[PDB]
Amino acid sequence: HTDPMVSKGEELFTGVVPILVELDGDVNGHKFSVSGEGEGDATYGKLTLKFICTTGKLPVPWPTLVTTLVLCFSRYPDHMKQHDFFKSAMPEGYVQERTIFFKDDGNYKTRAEVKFEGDTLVNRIELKGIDFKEDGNILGHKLEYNYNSHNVYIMADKQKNGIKSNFKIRHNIEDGSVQLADHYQQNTPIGDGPVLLPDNHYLSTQSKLSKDPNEKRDHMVLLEFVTAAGITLGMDELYK
């Protein structure tokens, strides 16, 4: 690429990159840990990850953890690569913080560091959840094991030299309803190096959730794709 800052970030994501995810969680005092392993191919926006609850039964539904459990693997098309904050922060990485408000239920607060340790991309997360209903849709495990595709607007946060985003997820309830999960996110670089501050744009995501037939632990197999879009005034003019 013409931009050596783009080149630097992209060089770290060429090919297939191994991923480690670590989550320590406490929801209403229900403590748990999650480990995940797999690989990402940013050229395709493609994640293949297998997560295990290493402490026993997961006390919340797996779909409620998808957003928490690596946006540096998003596909940014060439015309947008100068807008890829997530890769530009590497290898030192970024902090990803969220609050996720489940309507008429509790909230998750998450803090994670996403960085390289050698050739492995690590996502190390702490999650705290409070004010849940012990018999509600989350602690009562009333959600379908699936994840609806959706689109999310990414905005520069110039003052924190990072990005912010807020977006709604709707988890399907077994009874046919939906449980809203209202996400507030912010990302800021680790360390004092430079980053690419993006124009506002969108990420589109789809996720397939499955089970490993040979796995006896509580677990989730995730096939996730994330693709960036927008910044199209110039590109669209090429075809008029």
XYZ file of C-alpha atoms in Angstrom:
240
model
C 0.000 0.000 0.000
C 1.152 3.588 -0.603
C 0.868 4.452 3.102
C 3.659 2.926 5.222
C 1.405 3.035 8.327
C -1.143 0.917 6.491
C 1.666 -1.333 5.323
C 2.840 -1.862 8.892
C -0.561 -2.926 10.184
C -1.416 -5.018 7.203
C 1.903 -6.836 7.352
C 0.960 -8.111 10.827
C -2.274 -9.564 9.467
C -1.063 -11.242 6.307
C -2.141 -14.798 6.137
C -3.692 -16.630 9.011
C -2.958 -15.376 12.501
C -3.429 -17.501 15.666
C -5.786 -16.092 18.301
C -6.028 -16.588 22.108
C -9.033 -15.247 24.012
C -9.153 -15.164 27.841
C -12.244 -14.007 29.780
C -12.641 -13.754 33.553
C -16.296 -13.074 34.317
C -18.557 -12.387 37.321
C -22.298 -11.883 36.679
C -24.346 -11.372 39.843
C -21.552 -13.149 41.710
C -21.684 -16.131 39.325
C -17.914 -16.380 38.539
C -16.628 -18.092 35.446
C -13.727 -18.246 33.027
C -13.722 -18.696 29.249
C -10.729 -19.649 27.060
C -10.866 -19.425 23.244
C -8.486 -20.503 20.499
C -8.470 -20.291 16.749
C -7.315 -18.060 13.927
C -8.186 -14.970 11.948
C -7.783 -14.081 8.273
C -8.305 -10.319 8.050
C -8.197 -10.315 4.219
C -11.523 -12.124 4.340
C -12.732 -10.640 7.648
C -12.877 -14.208 8.873
C -12.610 -15.614 12.441
C -12.730 -19.306 13.379
C -12.863 -19.609 17.150
C -13.702 -22.292 19.669
C -14.521 -21.176 23.239
C -14.664 -23.337 26.355
C -16.033 -22.484 29.765
C -13.213 -23.839 31.885
C -14.968 -23.451 35.229
C -18.022 -25.604 34.479
C -21.410 -24.486 33.210
C -21.459 -21.025 31.703
C -23.931 -19.010 33.840
C -25.060 -16.770 30.920
C -26.003 -17.702 27.334
C -23.134 -18.023 24.891
C -24.712 -15.580 22.367
C -24.536 -12.796 24.954
C -20.745 -13.092 24.949
C -20.081 -13.008 21.177
C -19.323 -9.286 20.955
C -17.126 -9.432 24.061
C -15.064 -12.515 23.072
C -11.117 -8.825 17.874
C -12.012 -6.152 15.325
C -8.479 -5.968 14.008
C -9.551 -9.002 11.925
C -12.212 -7.012 10.113
C -11.921 -6.752 6.346
C -11.138 -3.154 5.392
C -11.264 -2.872 1.554
C -8.348 -1.064 -0.049
C -10.114 2.297 -0.382
C -10.698 2.254 3.381
C -7.393 0.959 4.708
C -6.421 4.456 5.884
C -9.458 4.199 8.193
C -8.427 0.989 9.989
C -7.793 2.074 13.594
C -7.715 -1.476 14.893
C -4.766 -2.653 12.878
C -2.887 0.655 13.126
C -2.715 0.224 16.928
C -0.781 -3.038 16.580
C 1.354 -4.643 17.789
C 1.176 -2.705 21.056
C -2.599 -2.958 20.838
C -5.717 -1.208 22.075
C -8.110 -1.272 25.001
C -11.732 -2.138 24.149
C -14.242 -1.113 26.841
C -17.982 -1.635 26.701
C -21.145 -1.363 28.696
C -23.913 -3.684 27.442
C -27.372 -2.943 28.873
C -29.871 -5.808 28.576
C -33.253 -4.080 28.517
C -35.399 -4.903 31.568
C -32.416 -6.864 32.969
C -28.816 -6.378 34.044
C -25.699 -4.968 32.404
C -22.225 -6.163 31.463
C -19.175 -3.878 31.860
C -16.122 -5.203 29.979
C -12.506 -4.116 29.709
C -10.163 -5.885 27.338
C -6.641 -5.496 25.975
C -6.128 -6.687 22.425
C -2.463 -6.992 21.429
C 0.121 -9.283 19.956
C 2.221 -11.613 22.104
C 4.661 -12.756 19.463
C 2.680 -14.078 16.576
C -0.466 -14.696 18.626
C -3.210 -12.067 18.735
C -4.464 -12.042 22.363
C -7.795 -10.684 23.639
C -7.698 -10.542 27.424
C -11.001 -9.559 28.994
C -12.544 -8.833 32.355
C -16.357 -8.849 32.538
C -18.548 -7.683 35.435
C -22.298 -8.078 35.310
C -24.754 -6.631 37.847
C -28.506 -6.228 38.405
C -29.520 -9.384 36.540
C -32.772 -11.222 37.241
C -31.876 -14.699 38.460
C -34.882 -16.064 36.499
C -34.672 -13.673 33.527
C -33.673 -14.365 29.947
C -29.912 -14.279 30.660
C -29.472 -16.089 34.001
C -32.468 -18.267 33.068
C -30.968 -19.342 29.730
C -33.979 -18.473 27.612
C -32.057 -17.299 24.502
C -31.799 -19.177 21.223
C -28.309 -20.387 20.256
C -27.882 -18.097 17.252
C -26.807 -14.541 16.423
C -28.554 -12.095 14.044
C -26.471 -10.272 11.453
C -26.207 -6.529 11.989
C -24.443 -3.277 11.016
C -22.594 -0.938 13.354
C -21.446 2.660 12.923
C -17.847 3.460 13.889
C -16.969 7.016 14.850
C -13.693 8.735 15.519
C -13.139 9.926 19.062
C -10.458 12.492 18.287
C -9.953 13.559 21.901
C -9.095 10.034 23.090
C -7.233 9.350 19.808
C -9.493 6.336 19.399
C -12.972 5.339 18.320
C -16.414 5.004 19.776
C -19.499 3.096 18.717
C -22.969 2.406 20.102
C -25.288 -0.155 18.621
C -28.188 -2.466 19.463
C -28.118 -6.305 19.262
C -31.364 -8.283 19.542
C -30.991 -11.797 20.962
C -33.794 -14.158 20.018
C -35.816 -15.493 22.911
C -37.177 -19.051 22.711
C -40.616 -17.773 23.303
C -40.360 -15.734 19.875
C -39.548 -12.406 21.461
C -36.294 -10.476 21.484
C -33.958 -9.399 24.297
C -32.234 -6.117 23.423
C -28.550 -5.696 24.345
C -27.642 -2.002 24.002
C -23.882 -1.713 23.476
C -21.682 1.315 24.234
C -18.092 0.900 23.121
C -14.848 2.828 23.186
C -11.349 1.882 21.972
C -8.109 3.667 22.822
C -4.489 2.764 21.916
C -2.050 1.133 24.225
C 1.102 3.062 24.376
C 2.089 6.335 22.878
C 2.544 5.431 19.183
C 0.503 6.755 16.314
C -2.806 5.459 15.041
C -5.095 6.024 12.061
C -8.103 8.089 13.031
C -11.000 7.056 10.773
C -13.702 8.856 8.980
C -17.101 7.581 10.191
C -17.960 4.235 8.598
C -19.790 0.936 9.186
C -18.850 -2.632 10.078
C -21.227 -5.416 8.876
C -21.152 -8.727 10.786
C -22.525 -12.226 10.586
C -21.860 -15.060 12.970
C -22.660 -18.780 12.879
C -22.745 -20.589 16.225
C -22.313 -24.347 16.405
C -21.257 -27.188 18.656
C -18.348 -29.594 18.462
C -19.869 -33.107 18.676
C -16.770 -34.394 20.449
C -16.651 -31.705 23.175
C -18.069 -32.514 26.635
C -17.307 -29.106 28.178
C -19.711 -26.170 27.814
C -18.522 -24.444 24.678
C -19.214 -22.405 21.563
C -17.868 -22.778 18.050
C -17.957 -19.421 16.284
C -17.534 -18.580 12.565
C -17.606 -14.787 12.433
C -17.175 -12.379 9.529
C -16.757 -8.591 9.881
C -16.477 -6.295 6.854
C -16.037 -2.549 6.690
C -17.964 -0.273 4.368
C -18.580 3.376 3.590
C -16.307 6.182 2.492
C -17.728 5.724 -1.001
C -18.172 9.197 -2.549
C -15.085 8.876 -4.743
C -15.568 5.211 -5.517
C -19.208 5.634 -6.537
C -18.273 8.432 -8.987
C -16.011 5.981 -10.864
C -19.116 4.132 -12.134
C -21.225 7.103 -13.259
